[PDB]
């Protein structure tokens, strides 16, 4: 069932950002971990004295990284209008390496904003005209996670990423596979609350539960291919863990879709040694006897025998099979961490959630 | 003239410290941005609640990343005693990524702390026992800039790094190169009381002095192994770090390797995907200048591959050195790298041999 009730036109991922303690750091090891080339800038190189922010790409993929300046700074020369320094240094502190914003690409970045504040939505910023037909506003997400819009014509899509960055070429510079965001996840302490909030503002509709130590909802927008899951604690636990060193609700994963995730794989754990990601340690040996049972119809013995080479998960449902691994944590707590993940099937063009989220593999 | 006047028994760089916000993301990419594996961590998987600490490693050159945990921290299971996560915080707020500790390893760290602040040292963390025989002080050395002694019995040389600290063995993680230490220097407002203090408790000496628009003075130590430049700016590039880094603090450290056009090779493979950028080749008549000055110490497949990669050549009595500067490691205009090789003197190898690179403000 989809009641495709969304309160403003949804159109896809946009971006994420992370506030960092120092851009330069976060976004250069992301690019050697993932593969993901820099594709544009603004920062005092730019005439940005504020912010200096870093867009690593690879596919439709958009990781933005932000960190503040501390002296001589005018906070009219930053590119993104929400910008606060003192906020993000202490986000920085309050976190260490974390989301900051979600950001969806909508029709009307004032309509969406005006639609969710009057539907509930803390606002967070108010919508502003970026220039040349962008616009971006923002409202609360959950702690102090935001939802960012952005709105601009089609005819823009030709431009680097928004009004202020330059653009970046990357000649000698190949991706790993990664292609699009999948889906981001948030804990918080309370579903009940969190998903009527946050439900209530978008009309972004229920599209999979998962009750169990967690209890999951999948929101997503009216197409599916806008999915943001929120976790809950049950009751010690994963998700308890995360909200007590992270000090708040905030983004536990993020989940990046590859159309050879086995080629992308190797790529990153290459890197993972020097500097790249780590990932988690591969089931026993049994677990894939038992995906040769489960997925030996779509995936072939030799697939198999990669997936257990490199560690990876397989779970299915109907009519689709996906592929998972995760990393571990990507900074120095015990909070955020990676999903890369391929989905098999469901081409009807492929339907979101295509295999489900990895629910028949917690057995481990 | 060498006066050898050290107040305390000065054995060599041990590591440097940066204070960070994130220490993973910084570690990260200067391990792959150097080739410095992982080699030894102190964090929450090692029962410390208050800080992560990742140390690298490339030969002799030890980097230390250190955040502060947040939430749940427990200041009492710090394997570093000095550290303070309010200090850190602040510390972060105030210079973005940057030293906070410059280590030497001495004879007695106790001793060289008690004869440091008998000489007007400002006292930063009291000495401390870390068990096994290391000890620990720190001194101030300029702004928010510890100078740090640590002392051990030769004995122990094969523990990781400090008491508390587990190592990582990172299978076949393979280095560029780079060796040790060569110098490590500090941008102040004003160099004549920020040396006479620095020289005064420490003993010290100079070693070099230049004028550029920048004005530096060499100390060394005894040995000449540990060589702490100054700089102030003419009344400009040191006066952008200043502003950025809001007071003095450490501008660049220079990394030596035995062989670094190999090493900046592997480097400069690195920049594309995240690593760190070099600044830009000098033109094709700063080599022809190269050729005039150093053809009796470099062969011309030596001068070609330096000018493909960039690098400076520089000579004083009877030595060279290789140099290149990074951009700076992180978002400001702040803290830079310095990547050489000094060819000649060989008398082991004289300190400073070749110079530190005064003749190429021309290129
Ligand atoms: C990575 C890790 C580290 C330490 C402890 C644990 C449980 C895990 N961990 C996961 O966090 C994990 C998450 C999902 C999944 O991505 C999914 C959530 O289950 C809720 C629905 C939406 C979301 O996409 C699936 C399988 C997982 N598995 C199998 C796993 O082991
Ligand atoms: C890298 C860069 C960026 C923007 C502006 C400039 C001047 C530079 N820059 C340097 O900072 C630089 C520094 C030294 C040198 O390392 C040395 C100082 O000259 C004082 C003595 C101790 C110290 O070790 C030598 C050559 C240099 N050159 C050639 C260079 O261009
Ligand atoms: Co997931
Ligand atoms: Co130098």
């Known amino acids: 069932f989809n009641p495709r009730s969304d309160r403003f036109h949804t159109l896809a991922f946009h971006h994420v950002e992370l506030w960092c303690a120092d851009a330069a750091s976060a976004a250069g090891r992301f690019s050697f ?11 005092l190189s730019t005439g940005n004295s504020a912010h200096a922010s870093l867009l690593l790409r690879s596919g439709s993929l958009s990781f933005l990284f932000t960190a503040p300046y501390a002296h001589g700074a005018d906070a009219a020369t930053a590119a993104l209008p929400s910008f606060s320094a003192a906020a993000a240094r202490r986000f920085a502190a309050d976190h260490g390496l974390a989301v900051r914003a979600v950001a969806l690409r909508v029709a009307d970045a004032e309509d969406a904003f005006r639609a969710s504040v009057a539907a509930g939505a803390r606002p967070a910023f108010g919508p502003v005209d970026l220039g040349r037909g962008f616009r971006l506003a923002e409202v609360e997400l959950y702690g102090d996670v935001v939802l960012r819009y952005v709105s601009y014509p089609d005819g823009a899509a030709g431009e680097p990423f928004l009004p202020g960055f330059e653009g970046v070429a990357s000649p000698g510079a ?10 981001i996840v948030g804990n918080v302490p309370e579903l009940a609350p969190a998903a009527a909030y946050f439900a209530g503002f978008t009309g ?5 539960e998962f009750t169990t130590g967690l209890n999951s909802m999948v929101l997503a927008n009216n197409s599916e291919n806008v999915l943001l899951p929120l976790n809950e604690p049950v009751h010690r636990s994963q998700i308890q863990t995360f909200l007590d060193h992270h000090g708040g609700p905030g983004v536990q994963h993020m989940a990046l879709a590859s159309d050879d995730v086995l080629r992308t794989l190797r790529e990153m754990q290459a890197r993972s040694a020097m500097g790249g990601f780590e990932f988690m340690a591969p089931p026993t ?6 995906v040769r049972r489960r997925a030996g119809d779509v995936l072939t ?8 080479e490199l560690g990876v998960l397989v779970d ?4 689709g099979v996906l592929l998972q691994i995760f990393t ?7 909070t955020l961490f990676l999903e890369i993940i391929q989905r098999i099937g469901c081409m009807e063009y492929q339907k979101g959630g295509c295999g489900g ?5 917690f057995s481990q």
């Open 328 to 334: 571990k944590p990507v900074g120095d707590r015990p």
């Open 301 to 308: 013995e030799a697939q198999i025998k990669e997936c257990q």
């Open 316 to 319: 299915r449902d109907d009519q």
């Open 357 to 361: 989220f990895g629910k028949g593999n």
């Open 204 to 208: 972004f509709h229920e599209f999979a």
């Open 33 to 43: 971990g993932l593969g993901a080339p820099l594709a544009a800038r603004s920062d």
């Open 174 to 183: 190949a991706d790993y596979g990664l292609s699009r965001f999948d889906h």
């Open 285 to 290: 040996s049994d677990y894939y006897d038992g």
